[PDB]
Every structure is written in C-alpha cells, then in structure tokens.
RNA sequence: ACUCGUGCCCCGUGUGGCGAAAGGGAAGCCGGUUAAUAUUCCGGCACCUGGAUGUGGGUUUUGCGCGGCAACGCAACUGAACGCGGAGACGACGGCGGGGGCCCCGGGCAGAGUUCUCUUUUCUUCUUAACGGUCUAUCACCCUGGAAACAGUUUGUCUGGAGAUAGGGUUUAAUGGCCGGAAGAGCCCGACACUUCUGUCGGGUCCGGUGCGCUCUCGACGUCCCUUGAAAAUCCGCGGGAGGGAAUAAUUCUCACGCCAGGUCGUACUCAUAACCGCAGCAGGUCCCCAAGGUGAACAGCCUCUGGUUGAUAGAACAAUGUAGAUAAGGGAAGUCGGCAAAAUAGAUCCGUAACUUCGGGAAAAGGAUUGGCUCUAAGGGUUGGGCACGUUGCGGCGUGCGGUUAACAACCAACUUAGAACUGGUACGGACAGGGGGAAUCUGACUGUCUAAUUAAAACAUAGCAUU
C-alpha cells in the first residue's frame, strides 16, 4: 500500500477569525466520498488537524489533490467568503488560502 | 558516367603532370 | 481617441483574434500612446491589456446520450431514419464472420485438435452458408470427432 | 498581379511620378496662365492602357 | 548533427583545425553530460552518464579550445 | 603540341530558332523580429552544382579488392571508340489492407466557470522541423525436399511435378520505434522588482484506449473497351578491352575530412453585396487549396465553437389598393378555354402486390399495420495459460526424448448492431426539420442525348439498325 498526505493551510483567515478550522474539519468528514458513497471514511482516510490553522489528510487509496480543491471552494462558497479568499497551490500536495488585493 | 565528369579527371591529371615536372 | 491600431497590434502580440482583446476602459489616454509592438508588450505585462477566455461549449449531454444507448434506451423504431443496410451493411457482417471462422480453424489445426483432411472439408463448408456463428462450428466439430472415434 | 515583367514595372513607376500637383511658385511668374494640373489620373476613374 | 560513440575519437575530432568552439550541457533531471564541438560541416555530440569522467575529459581537451557551460535560459 | 596562333590527326546519314509562372525539372527547415517585408532580415542547424586541390584510409612485391552453395553483401576496389538496357513516362472505376493528421473515451498535475440543492463536476494547455544514424515493415527471389485420403488460401477461386505445404535465408519500400538536432526552444502557472531605462527568479511541460469514423498517401488484387490512355532535355548500369601504372614507391581509388564561388528580373496590397468586367461603391458574371461539435443514412435542413461582422437614410402612425406569409363553418370543381394556383401523399420496419411484356421489367404497382419514455432480459468478439524425464543458462529460457486432445476450462479486455418482456401518459410519439398523390385509356417519338444567349424545348435534330452509289 502507498500512502499520500495533503495539507491545507488557512493561517491568515484563522488569525483574523473569519475562517474556523473545526467546521472545516467537520465539513470534510461527512462530505468526502469513498467508492461512490458518503460516510464510508474508514481506515482509508485520516483527517487529523495539526492545530496552527492547518488540516492534514492521509490517504491509502487513490485520491487526487484536485478533488480536495473542489471541496474547499465549495466550503468557501457556502460561507460567502468567495469574494476575499482564493485557494492557490504553493508546492507539492499543499494548498494555501490567500487574500485578494 | 557523363562526359563532363570524365573531362574533369583527365584535366586534373594533365595539370598535376606539368606541375610535377615544374617541381622537377 | 481612436484605438483601432492598438487593438490590431494587441491581437498579433497575444496570438488571438481581435474579438478576444480587452482594453482597459479607464486608461484610454495611456493606451493611446502605445504605437510600437514593444509598448504593447509592456502594457500586457502591467495588466492593462488582457486576453479574454473562450465561450463555453460542453459535451455533457452528448456523452450522456451515448451511455444510455449502450443499454438500449433510444434505439426504437421511431428513432431510425436510414435503412437497415445503411446502419449496418451486410457485407461487413459477412466479412467479420468469415475472418472469425477462419481464425478458429487455423488455431485447432496448429494445436492438433484436427488434421488437414478435416480442416480442408470444414473450410469449404464455412465458405458456404453452413455455420451461423462460432458456437455452431464448435458443436459440429465435437460431433464429427465423436463419430470418428467409432 | 505580383508576377510582373520589367517593362510593365517601368511603366507603372512613370505613371505615379506624373501624378502630383503643380508647385506654388509657378503661379506667381509674369504672364502665367496655368491654374491646376489638367492631366490628373486616379485608379478609380480612368484606366491606363498597360 | 552526428553522434560520437567513444571518447578516443571525440578527442581526435577536437584536435582539428576547423574546430571553432565547444560547450558543455548538463541535464540534472536525467543525470547526463553532453559534450558538443562545432566544426565546419557538422556538430558532434558525445553523451556521458557518470560524472567522474567529465572533469577527466575536460582537462584532456586541448588548451586552445574555448569551452562554455550553456547557461539556462539563454538570452536572445 | 604550338619556341610563339600559323601546324598536324581522327569520325561523319542529317542539317535552325520561338513556343507551358497548372506538363517534364539539382538544392532549406525551426524559433524570433516591423507601423508596414520575410521558407528572402537575425540566431541556430543543413543541403546542391561547378571549380581547384592536400591529408587519412584502400590496392599493387607474380599489376587493376575480399566474403557467401545461392539470392547477394561490404568505406573504397582502372576502363577510350563503338553498342545494348533502365529511369524521366502516364486511363477511368470497385472493394480490401498499412501509415501520418483530425475527431472520440479514461487517469494525473496546474488554472478558470457554477455551487438555495446536485455534480470525485464543466472548460483550457500538456508540442517536437528539415537533415542524419540504427533496428524493422507487403510483393518478389534463393537453398533443402518431393505432394491423391490432393493440399495451401482471399470479403471477392486463384496457386502448385514448368516443383506446392513446411523449415531456413536474401532483398525493393518509412509519413514506424529509439538516438543526434533538443530543451538551451516554444507553451502554462507562481513570487518579487520596475516612473522610465529595465527586468529577475522559481515550478511544470506525463500515461493509456477505441473505430464499416473524416482527410491525404502507399500496396496487393479486380472490372471496361470495334476507346488501350504525350514528347524532349537530363542522369545511371552493363557488353567490349583502347591506353596507363609499384617494389619503394606508384595509384584518371564513384571512401572520409578539408579550400573557393554561385550573376539578372518579380516579391507591397485586393481577389470581390466597395480594390477585376458590366458608363458606378450595380442583388449580374469570373479558375483553385484547407474544412470542427450535436441530431441524422448523409457536404440535406436546424442549433453551436474558432475566426469574422453588427454594413446597407432614419423617426412616428396602422386608412384604401397592393407585394410576400397564412387559416376558415356546410358543400366539394357547381368556377374556368382548361383543376391555372393551392391542398392532399411522403422517413424506417413488417405484411401484400394485377393486366401486359422484347422475360430484363411493370414495382415504391394498388392496399394495410407499427413507431415516445422508463426498468430489464438474450445474442453476435479479442489476448494470455496448459503433463512428465534428462543437460546448459542468473522462477531460470531453452537443446531435446516423449505423452496428450482438458467430454473445452480459467483470468483479463471492448464498441456498436439486432431481437423480446413488464410498467407508464388527456391514444400521444419520422411530435421541429426533412419528406413520392394514385388508377383505366387514346395520339405521337423507340430509349439516354441536342438547339432558336433576350417571346416557341417540341411530335423538330442526332442516334444504333437497314438499303442504295
Ligand atoms: K515550367
Ligand atoms: K523593411
Ligand atoms: K595511403
Ligand atoms: K578493400
Ligand atoms: K505527362
Ligand atoms: K487508407
Ligand atoms: K487513415
Ligand atoms: K490515423
Ligand atoms: K468522432
Ligand atoms: K527538405
Ligand atoms: K498436385
Ligand atoms: K465485398
Ligand atoms: K478532394
Ligand atoms: K587493361
Ligand atoms: K513578399
Ligand atoms: K504577400
Ligand atoms: K489573383
Ligand atoms: K455532424
Ligand atoms: K448536418
Ligand atoms: K398596414
Ligand atoms: K394596407
Ligand atoms: K371543372
Ligand atoms: K370548353
Ligand atoms: K408514417
Ligand atoms: K386504334
Ligand atoms: K431525351
Ligand atoms: K425555346
Ligand atoms: K424538354
Ligand atoms: K432541331
Ligand atoms: K427498321
Ligand atoms: Mg450483396
Ligand atoms: Mg524556349
Ligand atoms: Mg511546372
Ligand atoms: Mg564540391
Ligand atoms: Mg565497363
Ligand atoms: Mg526525434
Ligand atoms: Mg530511422
Ligand atoms: Mg513458405
Ligand atoms: Mg532526444
Ligand atoms: Mg521550457
Ligand atoms: Mg499582409
Ligand atoms: Mg477570396
Ligand atoms: Mg458585384
Ligand atoms: Mg469597375
Ligand atoms: Mg450517428
Ligand atoms: Mg421606416
Ligand atoms: Mg394574398
Ligand atoms: Mg371550407
Ligand atoms: Mg369542415
Ligand atoms: Mg368528398
Ligand atoms: Mg399545379
Ligand atoms: Mg406504397
Ligand atoms: Mg402502371
Ligand atoms: Mg424523344
Ligand atoms: Mg428564346
Ligand atoms: Mg422557353
């Protein structure tokens, strides 16, 4: 088995208290689909939180980073933060939230 | 081969012979 | 202010059509001073001239209909316009079948399940309209070897 | 057409060097009667015969 | 352009009157070293995998030849 | 050869020019650059012809190379007069197979659109030139051997004692795989500088599948003719054996590398509801190349992407009479010279089909039935595996001696075409587009073809057949 890790960094909105991680961690748990179904997150996906406004994800199956980016935008749209925050890839397997100008 | 091609080769031989004479 | 020259120069530098060139509405005076190709490039880098994206044309409905027909959903009698031979020509059906039947006989003869005298006789039977498909040929071979056993 | 011969090229050169107005100082000479150019030609008006 | 197989022939090529210049290109992603010499009619390329002979080869070249290093993103 | 042009010696059947920017024909590709040119300028990397020529290699000690049974191979590897041969060099149509480009499907990394709800979602980029090296690819040819219980074999019946099947080889033909060219280029993201002058730096630029698909090109087959489908310049091979040449040098070695040069004229732009011809910025006329998605048999009609237009004097009102588009109760040609105009029929599947006839037709004769949506069922294919006993080889892969025909099994992969059943609806379903009215007879020309450009397309002309001079 091969394990992949993905990191989402939201330090700036977390420090400004506009984006909270606990709801984001909750949003990922009951939304990610495994084998076509929701709620099948068992011993294949890990959703631990590092704590400093960062979420860490461990996958044992074939998961794609673009899938995670698709979910993050969906969360931002729901909370109506789309006009100030954008999600950008800074390195391999890491996605960061940044403010507009 | 064409005649112009053969004319070049015998022309070179004649020049070389007169030059090697001039050398000698 | 007349900007026809600038729009023509922008399309050449951006490598697009003139219908895809965007000029900043609030910088017309600044854009009008660009007369060379070098100055057009600098205004592109600074973000006053951009290339617009293409218009949407998706095949979602197209490939949705294709999948529904793989399980027989939109192929009734009220959905056909050409003739049967136009949709599936008979000459293609015949050509496929002969290649299938001739491929089998070479396989059996090479392994050893039949000999050349039975191979030749079955070959000309297949050229005639004897065996309907691959299953019919195989059943005929088994009965032939059963009676040859006695 | 882009394909041209040298004789036709020579003719076209002369036809456009003969298509300018008269200079201004010609009109101030004593006993002058020339007003304009009476042989002006335009590609949309009159066809030159080769 | 033509390829050279061994090292001995490539050294003999560089000892020719019509040898104008030479350069070294290294591809770190695939770990290759390429030696190119510019002659009258052709450009000759020699491909090496290791890196313990590149400097050995470099010092064996004649001293009058000009060798560059092919910087990334060559200016127009 | 000339002392130096003057002079000698051979062959002789024949002896002008113009005429093609679509015929024949030596040689260049990629990236960048301008307000306006570029296969022509800049950078890199090549090629052809002609002319001089030196090194390396090759041949020759008895003079002009070796190898293979053979088809033939190899970096070279003498060859005059005269002669023979090949290339240039050729029709239309039909189905089939290989290759490049386009279209289509699945996965991944980046960026963008939508997000009340749904959608691991929708869209875009992911490229590789000329010129070379190396390994291969139908036809055909060579060696062994000797076929009837005849065999091989195409979608399409051709091939073989004038030598098949089979085993092993040689060779024409890349727009095929890998390498040089070449990632240093081009393209997509991100982060800083910068009045300008100026820019600078990080990442990425992958992996598979499918087909009666469209377009170009190549190959092997076939059909047709009382029709058999250009010439010349130019380039090569061979038969012959004239002349010439070394033993320390010689070499008119079609091998590798090296030196020099390539004059003259055209090249902007349009090619058409405004750049040509029609008196004009005229709804007319005027030869070609490239050719996306959906529906569908389809270059039909209808909608969309790239690219391109928004240009044809306008504003207000809704009388008669018009031009163009349409619908009408009941009757159904009573109108009119005359059914003129309009209406009615129409795709596909399954039934059914007369008189007459030159036996080929008439024939889609005439006349009937079905067709949507959803949930299922069945059929039509490809690839890979097969048990012992010896010896070699970093589970070996095989040199074998065998045994056997799994009462045909297992795993994986992939589009479409056809047939049947249940359920369901204001009985509707080729729902727009697209799309034959039919029958019984008379006159006349056999048929297909042709003409009065601008009032007549016909029973007129031509035609095969027949006869005469
Ligand atoms: K020509
Ligand atoms: K210029
Ligand atoms: K030598
Ligand atoms: K030799
Ligand atoms: K011709
Ligand atoms: K083809
Ligand atoms: K093709
Ligand atoms: K193809
Ligand atoms: K397609
Ligand atoms: K070329
Ligand atoms: K025989
Ligand atoms: K056929
Ligand atoms: K065509
Ligand atoms: K001789
Ligand atoms: K030009
Ligand atoms: K041009
Ligand atoms: K033209
Ligand atoms: K279509
Ligand atoms: K269509
Ligand atoms: K009116
Ligand atoms: K009116
Ligand atoms: K009537
Ligand atoms: K009447
Ligand atoms: K119908
Ligand atoms: K009668
Ligand atoms: K006719
Ligand atoms: K007429
Ligand atoms: K007519
Ligand atoms: K007539
Ligand atoms: K007659
Ligand atoms: Mg048929
Ligand atoms: Mg001529
Ligand atoms: Mg020509
Ligand atoms: Mg030369
Ligand atoms: Mg000879
Ligand atoms: Mg390549
Ligand atoms: Mg090759
Ligand atoms: Mg054989
Ligand atoms: Mg390469
Ligand atoms: Mg790059
Ligand atoms: Mg132009
Ligand atoms: Mg045009
Ligand atoms: Mg017109
Ligand atoms: Mg005109
Ligand atoms: Mg279709
Ligand atoms: Mg009006
Ligand atoms: Mg009316
Ligand atoms: Mg009525
Ligand atoms: Mg009625
Ligand atoms: Mg009635
Ligand atoms: Mg009518
Ligand atoms: Mg009918
Ligand atoms: Mg009838
Ligand atoms: Mg007639
Ligand atoms: Mg008339
Ligand atoms: Mg008429």
UniProtKB/Swiss-Prot annotation, chain B:
One of its GO terms (biological process) is cytoplasmic translation. GO terms for cellular component: cytosol; cytosolic large ribosomal subunit. Residues 1-24 are annotated as: Disordered. The keyword Iron-sulfur does not apply. Its main location: cytoplasm. It holds the Pfam family Ribosomal_L41. One of its GO terms (molecular function) is structural constituent of ribosome. Transmembrane segments: none annotated. Component of the small ribosomal subunit (SSU). Mature yeast ribosomes consist of a small (40S) and a large (60S) subunit. The 40S small subunit contains 1 molecule of ribosomal RNA (18S rRNA) and 33 different proteins (encoded by 57 genes). The large 60S subunit contains 3 rRNA molecules (25S, 5.8S and 5S rRNA) and 46 different proteins (encoded by 81 genes). Component of the ribosome, a large ribonucleoprotein complex responsible for the synthesis of proteins in the cell. The small ribosomal subunit (SSU) binds messenger RNAs (mRNAs) and translates the encoded message by selecting cognate aminoacyl-transfer RNA (tRNA) molecules. The large subunit (LSU) contains the ribosomal catalytic site termed the peptidyl transferase center (PTC), which catalyzes the formation of peptide bonds, thereby polymerizing the amino acids delivered by tRNAs into a polypeptide chain. Present with 11900 molecules/cell in log phase SD medium. This is Small ribosomal subunit protein eS32A. It comes from Saccharomyces cerevisiae (strain ATCC 204508 / S288c). The lineage of its organism: Eukaryota, Fungi, Dikarya, Ascomycota, Saccharomycotina. The gene is RPL41A.
